[PDB]
Amino acid sequence: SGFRKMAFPSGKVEGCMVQVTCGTTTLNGLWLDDVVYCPRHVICTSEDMLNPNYEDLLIRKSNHNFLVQAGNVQLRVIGHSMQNCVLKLKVDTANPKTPKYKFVRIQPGQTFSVLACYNGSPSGVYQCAMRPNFTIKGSFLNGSCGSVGFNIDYDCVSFCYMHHMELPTGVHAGTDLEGNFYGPFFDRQTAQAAGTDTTITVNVLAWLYAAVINGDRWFLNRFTTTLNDFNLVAMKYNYEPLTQDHVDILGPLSAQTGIAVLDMCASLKELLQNGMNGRTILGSALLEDEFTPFDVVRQCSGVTFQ
């Protein structure tokens, strides 16, 4: 029993974190085989931090203008290239701790673990989600850029995020590991700002199923709803539309609990319209939307506490 914001064990990623320096700029890099991946703005100086032309800045650099430190070992850079907003530094040593890995570009609504790092050294691990507006509600300070987000499946690390920027609302923007930003953001100091965000409906439903698995039914009701009528309420509360594919994805949790998806939708409708009346669900007074259906299955018992 219990239900926690649960991150993946971070060891396989810790062994990949390094420090990249160019000029007086240092940030984190990810060392896999003989390549170190890091945000390309490591090549910016104090005077470049507005609207840099990265191709023009990078052609002025040589391999030896980059320093890569792995622990107390300096790795020599023997090639470099820019791919989108990521710099790839070829180094003379293959990381002996390279895990089995993939790069994935995730969809909004999906969750991942972040290994927050400073000076190439891991500091902490937490769970977040790719928001519908393609920001993340991270926890990042100066020096964190290059920290990565990941999921793990049967000892394969799927990297999905590299940290680049903090937006004016205090949320975060970054890239996939091929250097493409999530959302409409850029690695430049310009007017960018999160678009209006929405609540991830399929995830709230998954978390309600988690609450039932763990023995709590107080929020259920005798009603059902059509998908169309539910979505008319969702829209009013700034929730994402629920699709039939979401309904299908929730199939297993519905089967394990004996509660039809559209019946859980009617419970959620009532919660939106009435509030919680001072009660909590899985220790929260808000409707939590950063657990996916997979996250619930991963953490919860396959046996419902009936």
Added chain:
Amino acid sequence: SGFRKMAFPSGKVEGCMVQVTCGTTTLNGLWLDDVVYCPRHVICTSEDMLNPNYEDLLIRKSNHNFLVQAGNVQLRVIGHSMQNCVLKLKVDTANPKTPKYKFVRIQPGQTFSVLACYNGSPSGVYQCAMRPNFTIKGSFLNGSCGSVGFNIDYDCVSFCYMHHMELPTGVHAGTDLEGNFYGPFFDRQTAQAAGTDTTITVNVLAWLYAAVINGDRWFLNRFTTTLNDFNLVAMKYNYEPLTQDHVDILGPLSAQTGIAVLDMCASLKELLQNGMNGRTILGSALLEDEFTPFDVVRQCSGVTFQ
């Protein structure tokens, strides 16, 4: 910016997790140097799971009745001893991944990271607190016993918890790494139940300071309170008394924000008496009490967003 339930990176602990089998019972163990630590009830069978006499059960075992598996490598047991509720198995191989480490018995109110493990294999990492009633609100299924809790300081792992039991309310009980339970609990199937819990006041105050550091002041007021008058309100809301030592511990966060501790106490008093009026603090609609003052300093900027 941001503020997350942040666990320590778990790599140094992952490398210590092993599987211990006795009879048909398998659970997790912690391999440090040439010793494997695990819950002593690994020696129980289906018929022992009520009121076992552990000294009588253990004298009937030999070293070769214990199997220790580290990955796909079987470690041979060459000695055993019981210390309180923990079994110590001496093995023929010292763990080459043994980190620098300590065993600590923590005080209630302190937080730690849990590496949840099944079959000797790490599954996830989350943050919890030792509750005033010496339970933890963990997330544990069958097969999790022997999973450990820890803090890390300058690459020294301080182990503080080993998981043993789930109580009827779904919360968890366990031991320090010397095998002494936290709280009044036993490794036996008897009427035990969590005592009444309380909210960790000094931690709520620390988290309010975190909210101010990150730029949010909506809950502050112009009032102050005496320590005695605050504690009369605390008692009414099932909060722990706040001591002068708590006040002292909050000194640094008070100094960084310019808000006197007893002024923050008056803010907390008002929150308790009025509620939040539908507003949130650091993304929560409840007063969070599982961040210590140290946790806030560790995660937050040393520069307040004024």
